[PDB]
Amino acid sequence: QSKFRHVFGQAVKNDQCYDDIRVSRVTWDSSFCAVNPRFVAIIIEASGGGAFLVLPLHKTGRIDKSYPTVCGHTGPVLDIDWCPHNDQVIASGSEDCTVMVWQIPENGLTLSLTEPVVILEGHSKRVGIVAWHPTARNVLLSAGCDNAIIIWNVGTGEALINLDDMHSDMIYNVSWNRNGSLICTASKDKKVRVIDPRKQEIVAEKEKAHEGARPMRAIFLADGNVFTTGFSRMSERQLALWNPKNMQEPIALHEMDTSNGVLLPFYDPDTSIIYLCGKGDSSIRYFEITDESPYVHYLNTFSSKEPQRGMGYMPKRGLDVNKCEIARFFKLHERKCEPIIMTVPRKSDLFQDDLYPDTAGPEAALEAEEWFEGKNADPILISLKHGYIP
């Protein structure tokens, strides 16, 4: 009976792709791609040091080899994240052990961008993880191969939290909860941790959340549940759903297939859909999360003949309500970025308001100093109906 059962993906025509990109060749498990309503950012092969490419969404077709890039890093770029409160601002983590924050010029680059707004220098090792705070302006989390998590005030350039003796082994990912009061981590010691970064304490963990000696991912759902991907002892890709108030036993665990890539979860809290795709997969599998067991329900698979090297995900503000678009993927091939549009088939030409509840907007709910000092706020919601045409 699920309203999302006919959700389907459709790749755009080649003339709506971004072509002749030289995607990074590093063996780091990066997503290589970050998208916002103005720009697509792609981690590329740099002559020296490190670079990423920033394209206006309209700049489709073959990209000139000399198109300007963001190239101020002195080591390969490993992760990129657009500022949720500023569509001209992006953070990068590098093998040069820095996080850099960049101001993109209006309409994108004319000249190569070599000087960041700020360099953050707390890590002693490569920085593979950057995550902007969901609600607090200028709060930015990095995690490095030093196994330190640092939470920055980007406005002052100061490390205000250093979690440096919490993780004995490599950190695979860090995710903020809805109001950014908590983070969750997955680590190569096979633990998933829920952390209060301001209290600097672990509030819940699960040992061996997955048994495989392969990477995991852990993210928060809108209701405070933690959703994980990983591998069985037998190389099966798995997903699980955990109540952090009681992590002994999973609410749900599902075995999927025996491919090699870790499943990156993309969670849409507005539809309760989770999309899963791994490096090397030609498929995007999507599930609905509901309060009816077994709680994680299979919807469908987007199928293709081409494996992904990385994947970006368009925030709600960039979607087309008239088309009932509920997600847009930016699928990285070897030399190309290919938008994939997820739509709900609907007969009616009316505004499908059930698909588009008010969504987390770009206005920061509180300042860095307020949040660091212990204040909390929810995302400030906006309506998407201004985009509707009769």
UniProtKB/Swiss-Prot annotation:
GO terms for molecular function: actin filament binding; small GTPase binding. Keywords: Acetylation, Actin-binding, Cell membrane, Cell projection, Coiled coil, Cytoplasm, Cytoskeleton, Endosome, Membrane, Repeat, Synapse, WD repeat. It comes from the Eukaryota. One of its GO terms (biological process) is endosome membrane tubulation. It is found in: Cell membrane; Cell projection, Lamellipodium; Cell projection, Ruffle membrane; Cytoplasm, Cytoskeleton. GO terms for cellular component: actin cytoskeleton; cell cortex; endosome membrane; flotillin complex; focal adhesion; lamellipodium; lateral plasma membrane; ruffle membrane. The keyword Membrane applies. It is a peripheral membrane protein. WD repeats lie at residues 19-64, 72-112, 122-162, 166-196, 209-243, 257-297. Ubiquitous. Its main location: membrane. Plays a role in directed cell migration by regulating the activation and subcellular location of RAC1. Increases the presence of activated RAC1 at the leading edge of migrating cells. Required for normal organization of the cytoskeleton, including the actin cytoskeleton, microtubules and the vimentin intermediate filaments. Plays a role in endoplasmic reticulum-associated endosome fission: localizes to endosome membrane tubules and promotes recruitment of TMCC1, leading to recruitment of the endoplasmic reticulum to endosome tubules for fission. The C-terminal coiled-coil domain is essential for cortical membrane localization and oligomerization. Belongs to the WD repeat coronin family. Binds F-actin. Interacts with RCC2. Interacts preferentially with nucleotide-free and GDP-bound RAC1. Interacts with VIM (via head domain). Isoform 1 and isoform 2 appear as homotrimers, while isoform 3 seems to exist as monomers. Interacts with MICAL2; this interaction recruits MICAL2 to the actin filaments. This is Coronin-1C. It comes from Homo sapiens. The lineage of its organism: Eukaryota, Metazoa, Chordata, Craniata, Vertebrata. The gene is CORO1C.
